[PDB]
Design an enzyme around this catalytic site. Sequence first.
Site, PDB file in Angstrom:
ATOM      1  N   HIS B 349      66.309   0.832   7.761  1.00  0.00           N
ATOM      2  CA  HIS B 349      66.204   0.120   9.033  1.00  0.00           C
ATOM      3  C   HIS B 349      65.845  -1.360   9.022  1.00  0.00           C
ATOM      4  O   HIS B 349      65.901  -2.007  10.063  1.00  0.00           O
ATOM      5  CB  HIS B 349      65.205   0.849   9.937  1.00  0.00           C
ATOM      6  CG  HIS B 349      65.727   2.131  10.500  1.00  0.00           C
ATOM      7  ND1 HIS B 349      66.606   2.171  11.561  1.00  0.00           N
ATOM      8  CD2 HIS B 349      65.525   3.418  10.130  1.00  0.00           C
ATOM      9  CE1 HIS B 349      66.923   3.427  11.821  1.00  0.00           C
ATOM     10  NE2 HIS B 349      66.280   4.204  10.965  1.00  0.00           N
ATOM     11  N   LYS B 540      61.552  -6.558  23.966  1.00  0.00           N
ATOM     12  CA  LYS B 540      61.561  -5.923  22.652  1.00  0.00           C
ATOM     13  C   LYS B 540      60.146  -6.128  22.098  1.00  0.00           C
ATOM     14  O   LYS B 540      59.365  -6.896  22.666  1.00  0.00           O
ATOM     15  CB  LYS B 540      62.576  -6.637  21.745  1.00  0.00           C
ATOM     16  CG  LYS B 540      62.326  -8.159  21.610  1.00  0.00           C
ATOM     17  CD  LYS B 540      63.453  -8.917  20.858  1.00  0.00           C
ATOM     18  CE  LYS B 540      64.808  -8.908  21.601  1.00  0.00           C
ATOM     19  NZ  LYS B 540      65.869  -8.082  20.914  1.00  0.00           N
ATOM     20  N   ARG B 541      59.803  -5.459  21.002  1.00  0.00           N
ATOM     21  CA  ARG B 541      58.470  -5.643  20.427  1.00  0.00           C
ATOM     22  C   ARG B 541      58.258  -7.112  20.035  1.00  0.00           C
ATOM     23  O   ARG B 541      59.205  -7.801  19.629  1.00  0.00           O
ATOM     24  CB  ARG B 541      58.290  -4.739  19.202  1.00  0.00           C
ATOM     25  CG  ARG B 541      58.135  -3.274  19.556  1.00  0.00           C
ATOM     26  CD  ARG B 541      56.865  -3.048  20.358  1.00  0.00           C
ATOM     27  NE  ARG B 541      55.680  -3.334  19.557  1.00  0.00           N
ATOM     28  CZ  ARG B 541      55.017  -2.433  18.841  1.00  0.00           C
ATOM     29  NH1 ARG B 541      55.393  -1.158  18.847  1.00  0.00           N
ATOM     30  NH2 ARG B 541      53.954  -2.806  18.138  1.00  0.00           N
ATOM     31  N   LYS B 546      61.791 -11.953  15.676  1.00  0.00           N
ATOM     32  CA  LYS B 546      62.557 -11.796  16.911  1.00  0.00           C
ATOM     33  C   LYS B 546      62.583 -13.118  17.684  1.00  0.00           C
ATOM     34  O   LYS B 546      63.393 -13.317  18.588  1.00  0.00           O
ATOM     35  CB  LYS B 546      61.975 -10.667  17.769  1.00  0.00           C
ATOM     36  CG  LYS B 546      62.267  -9.273  17.201  1.00  0.00           C
ATOM     37  CD  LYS B 546      61.503  -8.183  17.936  1.00  0.00           C
ATOM     38  CE  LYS B 546      61.736  -6.817  17.307  1.00  0.00           C
ATOM     39  NZ  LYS B 546      63.161  -6.390  17.442  1.00  0.00           N
ATOM     40  N   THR B 648      69.284  -2.577  19.246  1.00  0.00           N
ATOM     41  CA  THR B 648      69.926  -1.599  20.121  1.00  0.00           C
ATOM     42  C   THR B 648      69.789  -2.076  21.557  1.00  0.00           C
ATOM     43  O   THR B 648      70.628  -1.776  22.412  1.00  0.00           O
ATOM     44  CB  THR B 648      69.323  -0.191  19.974  1.00  0.00           C
ATOM     45  OG1 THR B 648      67.897  -0.274  19.960  1.00  0.00           O
ATOM     46  CG2 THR B 648      69.811   0.458  18.701  1.00  0.00           C
ATOM     47  N   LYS B 652      72.330  -2.047  25.057  1.00  0.00           N
ATOM     48  CA  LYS B 652      71.959  -1.608  26.389  1.00  0.00           C
ATOM     49  C   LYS B 652      72.343  -2.657  27.430  1.00  0.00           C
ATOM     50  O   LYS B 652      72.894  -2.319  28.475  1.00  0.00           O
ATOM     51  CB  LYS B 652      70.449  -1.330  26.445  1.00  0.00           C
ATOM     52  CG  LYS B 652      70.011  -0.246  25.472  1.00  0.00           C
ATOM     53  CD  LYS B 652      68.498  -0.148  25.394  1.00  0.00           C
ATOM     54  CE  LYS B 652      68.112   0.631  24.149  1.00  0.00           C
ATOM     55  NZ  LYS B 652      66.672   0.474  24.148  1.00  0.00           N
TER      56      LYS B 652
END
EC number: 2.4.1.1
Lengths: 808, 808
Positions: B349, B540-541, B546, B648, B652
Amino acid sequence: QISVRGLAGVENVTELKKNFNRHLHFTLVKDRNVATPRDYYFALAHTVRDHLVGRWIRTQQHYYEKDPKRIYYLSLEFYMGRTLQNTMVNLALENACDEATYQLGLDMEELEEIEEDAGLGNGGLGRLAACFLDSMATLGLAAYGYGIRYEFGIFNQKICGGWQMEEADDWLRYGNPWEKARPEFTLPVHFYGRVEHTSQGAKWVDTQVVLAMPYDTPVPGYRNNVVNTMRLWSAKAPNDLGYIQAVLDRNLAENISRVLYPNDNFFEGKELRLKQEYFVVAATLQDIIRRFKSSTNFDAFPDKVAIQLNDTHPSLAIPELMRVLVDLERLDWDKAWEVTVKTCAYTNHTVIPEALERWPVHLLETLLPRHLQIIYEINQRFLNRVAAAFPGDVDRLRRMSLVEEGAVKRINMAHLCIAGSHAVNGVARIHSEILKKTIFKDFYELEPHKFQNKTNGITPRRWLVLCNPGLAEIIAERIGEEYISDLDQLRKLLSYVDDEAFIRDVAKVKQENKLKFAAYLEREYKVHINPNSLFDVQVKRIHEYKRQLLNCLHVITLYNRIKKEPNKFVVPRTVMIGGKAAPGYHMAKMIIKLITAIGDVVNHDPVVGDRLRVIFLENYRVSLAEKVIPAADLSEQISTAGTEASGTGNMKFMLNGALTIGTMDGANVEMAEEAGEENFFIFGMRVEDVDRLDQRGYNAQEYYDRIPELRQIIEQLSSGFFSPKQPDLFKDIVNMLMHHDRFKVFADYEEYVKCQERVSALYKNPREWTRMVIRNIATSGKFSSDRTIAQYAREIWGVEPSRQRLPA
Amino acid sequence: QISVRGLAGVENVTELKKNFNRHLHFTLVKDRNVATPRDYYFALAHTVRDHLVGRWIRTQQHYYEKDPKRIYYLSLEFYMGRTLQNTMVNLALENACDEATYQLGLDMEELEEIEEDAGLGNGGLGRLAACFLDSMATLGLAAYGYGIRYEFGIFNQKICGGWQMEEADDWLRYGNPWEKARPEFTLPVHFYGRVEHTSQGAKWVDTQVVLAMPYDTPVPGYRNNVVNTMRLWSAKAPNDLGYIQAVLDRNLAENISRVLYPNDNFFEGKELRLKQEYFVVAATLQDIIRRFKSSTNFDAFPDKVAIQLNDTHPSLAIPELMRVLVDLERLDWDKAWEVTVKTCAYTNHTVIPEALERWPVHLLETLLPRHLQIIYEINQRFLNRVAAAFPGDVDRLRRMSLVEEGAVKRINMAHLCIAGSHAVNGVARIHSEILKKTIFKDFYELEPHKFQNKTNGITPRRWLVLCNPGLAEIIAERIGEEYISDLDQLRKLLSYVDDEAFIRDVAKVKQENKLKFAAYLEREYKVHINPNSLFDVQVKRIHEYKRQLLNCLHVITLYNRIKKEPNKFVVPRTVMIGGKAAPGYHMAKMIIKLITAIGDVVNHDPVVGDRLRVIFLENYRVSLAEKVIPAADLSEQISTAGTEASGTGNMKFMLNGALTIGTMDGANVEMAEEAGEENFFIFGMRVEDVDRLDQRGYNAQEYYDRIPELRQIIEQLSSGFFSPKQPDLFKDIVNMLMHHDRFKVFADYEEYVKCQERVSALYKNPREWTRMVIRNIATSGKFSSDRTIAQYAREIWGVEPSRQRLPA
Ligand SMILES: OC[C@H]1O[C@H](O[C@H]2[C@H](O)[C@@H](O)[C@@H](O[C@H]3[C@H](O)[C@@H](O)[C@@H](O[C@H]4[C@H](O)[C@@H](O)[C@@H](O[C@H]5[C@H](O)[C@@H](O)[C@@H](O)O[C@@H]5CO)O[C@@H]4CO)O[C@@H]3CO)O[C@@H]2CO)[C@H](O)[C@@H](O)[C@@H]1O
Ligand SMILES: OC[C@H]1O[C@H](O[C@H]2[C@H](O)[C@@H](O)[C@@H](O[C@H]3[C@H](O)[C@@H](O)[C@@H](O[C@H]4[C@H](O)[C@@H](O)[C@@H](O[C@H]5[C@H](O)[C@@H](O)[C@@H](O)O[C@@H]5CO)O[C@@H]4CO)O[C@@H]3CO)O[C@@H]2CO)[C@H](O)[C@@H](O)[C@@H]1O
Ligand SMILES: *Cc1c(COP(=O)(O)O)cnc(C)c1O
Ligand SMILES: *Cc1c(COP(=O)(O)O)cnc(C)c1O
């Protein structure tokens, strides 16, 4: 099949089978091909539970409409046992379910054995709470049982090498279908903190908070459509805390309701136990006030609320009620005190000093700062009252104080309860008298009106109909079914004492019970008893005051006499002793080992054959009592006169057809009084005799020198006759009996042995033994907890019992 | 009401209302006069659950008959979210229940909001497991999800003073109606102990035992009457232990399943976490073997069993399988290894070093003695293979070893997984390529056949039909309902890109979603957004890779430009950022505070008005994602190229009508490839550009000196413009950006700002913006987890997917 189990209508049976299959499918998510007996037990349980909900909901609704005076029974123990069969009995569903399960191809009795006992009690005190709830519902009282939902009840006792081993009682493993979690009614409980004194009064701040989540269990009355509630609190931590540890430390707050302290009539001043006591008290009182305000002056509080304290365990209810009324509601002290005393009543369960709760002040000071201040204030005003009534009697003031002075200051919770209650009762006439003559004499002289007696009782539903269907049936054939909810009617059985048919039936039921138990003993324990011998049984918690040791001495005497004259005839006996010992009670654990040790010698001696057998019934609990009691011939109630407050097991045996051998102690006195002394096997010192012996001084040696049979037994224990590989294994027992016996075992030995010979003589005459049995059963009506509850209701709570059926 | 929610037949509605009232009465033990919305939610939940059981039971029965190959998905996370609506959707019960509740006078949408999210996951990896279970059931695969039933899931995030506060997620407080406890299938798990080597092989003895109790939750396929199972294990202590403490210490064993480690893409070598990993693995494998033997040579094991490892968390499955096969079943090593490799497959992952699991040998040695011996043995035989394939390449041997040498020996779980699996896959094309080019290059050269790609996907049921009914409806009106279980069909929507009616509907649904969210934001959070502005969202986290910080820089730039030229027109925007930070990730917690701090300045500046708003969406979780995603216009996927394995959330947003601004990272590449680059807002360095920058050396200072707008922002942060009372509050942020930025935020600043100007230009042209939106939705079919699962099934597990309906 039998009349008293109710009707089995075609529609009822048809509906029961339908609902049984619905639950197996939708509730247990199983099919007939994978289901196990366990799954079947649960399908039936949910089916029966359903019939209960409708009544449960309208009963509580009824109380909301009528708004009658509410009775709150506070106890840290509720020894419930199993609830499946009891529910069917009270709902007259037994035969219908028996048929419905039969048609499904299942044995209902097999399914009942799967249910776990709700063992949230230690013994007497806890079972009394259970019998009481049943009676209160049966008498239509708006009563609520309040306690703690321990996730681990009384430990499961296992015997290894003759020694007791404790195993965690994980009774909730497979789930509890009877309870209904009510997380929406969760309440906060405070601990620690400190007290701030403002201009607006005292304030308890910086406290640690623990949440109390309630679980309600239905309590059905006997065929009256009344279903009361037993609310048990569970501890939960608030959600507001590195991060992982903070989450894991939630267990610290939740440990409060983790396990029941396994002490029977013994005090242990541990902090966790004090938290449990306050936890149940604080949550219950908020619930009581909340419910009251939905009925703002508290002058009417005592007219709508009765709080009964089962022993001193929930004693903090008194200062907690004061705290709420004074600190939160802002009532003046004097007014708040009047209310408190008028709503609280206290029941004392024992007089032995080691059982009395005396909490160290430094403990209350850290855990409950405000409550200690309130207790001190209660004490001052109380002593001012004593001083004004008995001027100059300084020693009286020190004796009556709620605060005991010494190396470590302590709070006498019993004194706290007497001062803050309008009624204080013992649990048997002789016990209640002893309370005002000795231990609470000073209090009785200050307020004689507070002292009362309320002789204990047992519920005839669980202790007759449920455990002894055969006997209830033959009684019903002759006098009807009305006695089940009015035991006094059994007195009509005195008319059949000469009835040859009845005599034969009573004797037949007993033999069938013995055969069934002799079988059970062999099935689950591969033991080996003779159904024709006399079943001599003593089951109760292991205690020195209960004197299982005196019983042991008789057993050894019988054995030694047989070996003395092998070919002499002696009435065959199966001596059964069972009961749990508190984990840290060394002497109690030693007594269990002695019993099993005696069994190892006696049960394997060829010369004895099957004339004498000594069995130790392990893991004695409510479900086991329902099996052994109906099968007993002789009930052993041999505590030293003045030590057993009342006893209840004694009553269970009397109701089930066993004759009683015992001392004039507790309720034994009233039982013999009810049946007539000629129909009881009384022996030993009376309370007055124990007193004279203490004045003079108890010298066990004297009995040892004067009784050769007793000497022989002591010498066998010392030499290692019952412990070959460990010659001195029982040196503690011998040393205690010889030098530090607080219960004078030797003093009653001679009379006990002689009395035991007379029961043997009577057993040789089947007809006469049974006639005496009929005489005991016929006069046991007084010991129904319905009578007990009706007296509490009228003489303490101020409410009138009812037999009125509630709309179905 | 709307077509896709199914039919509302008179009989169905009538039956639903009946069952609803039955559960409220019998199950919740309530009446319409005391019931609360909570009670109503539960009555409906149990009603829907009922329709599930029949199918659940026959599905499992079907698998027993057919005995197909079983798929076991092992994951320590299953980010499920709520299950009420999802169940109605998959059972076509939505409209029937909506009507039935309407007639009862209840708002179903209000009741759905009461359900607690099952937050047993951290983010991406855990939600993927949830989407996968759904797809597997929808494709008729005999699949079982296996994990841990944490009693506390991902913490609830609260914002205090702009800072994140963690609160325990007590999701089981009110109970979970979806799960079914199966205490009858409890299994023992071993820990510690030691290894004895006999003539009969190795023996693991003197171990501590922890019981694993399973809880099964149904997983319904989409309208195919298939209901699979998700089995979650709970830790319980054996019953066989002064006495009180022994009972209380049971918590030590039960802490194993107490809480989910809140780390997203970050490794923390704690002992409790290792126990969790072995606990789920040991219990699951016994269950797998047991079920297999009910189908003794294991040569056929791989033909009947597939074990998929979701990351390395369940990596101990490999040596545990060897242990059982070798130690218990007595297969020879080589045979056991063949079986192991053929049944195990591993999914990677991430490639970030801090996320890789490397367990200290001294830890495995104490906790799992035998497994460490097996790992060493696996390693030796593996290196012998490497040595024989690459003679003399000594450095290769040290790089490929499962054992990392150094101050502290560690076990590289990723290397363990590659060696013991027949397939290793990345989660997006670019990620899978990166795996064989860099991090696992040596492994790819030794066994090129093991490496594969399986681009992630999301379930169109929960992420379209359930959260965006309005869009699913207008899509269905034109192309039918077949796309719901075959997303590729959305490609037919490309025919309406010029359809004036469609354009108007797509735009109308989006506006309605925004209005509904703008309302929700005001209701539960009393915030204040403008429904006409562009909804710029990044959820998102919180992570440095990120780059929420790059987003923050743009926000500040917009603000500074507005203040520069107050009366210039600028497209209005509502910038929403949400996500949780791991409790011990200081920098992540600082970024949250920066975001709220920016909001405090921007949202209260009169000159800005309602042209710019910065909102921090707190407690971002699955249920919240279902609300904000459908209402978004712009999806922010701006991780540094090469860091986001797949992502992901990006998918969405694409499915729900938002345009995407992002880097060529993870699945963004395949999305842009599917929609056409002209319909995506791509900017920044590609993976190759990041590499060149590293070779040369990243000097943030350079960008600071050459970009005045960037310099101004950094100076504002340093001087305390966003923290007046704490001038240096953000010194750590500035210092990191300037000297230790592993993710090169400044390097992409210029292109990001320019690209952001172009999305603003497009938003000014409603018609064209919507047409580009239609182009994204129409080509998002490839990102359905049904496609992903069908590829795993055919290329890894060796089973054929099915759309065949199962008998109702
Ligand atoms: O707020 C109103 C009230 O506050 C203050 O009084 C409080 C005290 O400061 C506080 O200590 C507490 O008093 C307790 C006392 O601490 C505790 O020891 C107990 O004292 C009893 C003895 O238990 C009892 O035996 C008897 O003592 C005899 C003793 O036995 C005898 O052998 C010989 O030593 O003489 C002693 C006294 O003659 O009586 C004492 C008390 O008389 O109980 C006390 C009260 O419960 O609480 C006080 C009130 O809450 C202020 O000081 C006071 O002015 C205020 O009225
Ligand atoms: O039971 C069969 C087997 O038992 C015995 O062997 C076992 C060892 O006793 C035991 O220690 C374990 O061996 C491990 C080893 O402990 C561990 O450190 C690891 O060793 C690898 C290195 O990780 C790897 O880097 C490489 O080492 C290089 C090093 O990197 C390089 O810089 C330089 O130092 O040279 C080193 C060697 O040339 O290789 C070593 C191993 O070659 O992994 C080992 C194996 O997993 O487990 C052994 C087997 O289970 C008996 O001694 C043996 O005879 C029997 O066959
Ligand atoms: C009734 C009962 C008791 C009380 O028995 P006593 O002989 O009064 O001590 C204790 N334990 C159980 C399980 C009982 O049923
Ligand atoms: C889908 C989802 C994620 C993953 O989002 P990314 O942007 O890929 O990190 C995380 N959390 C929740 C609640 C999600 O629904």
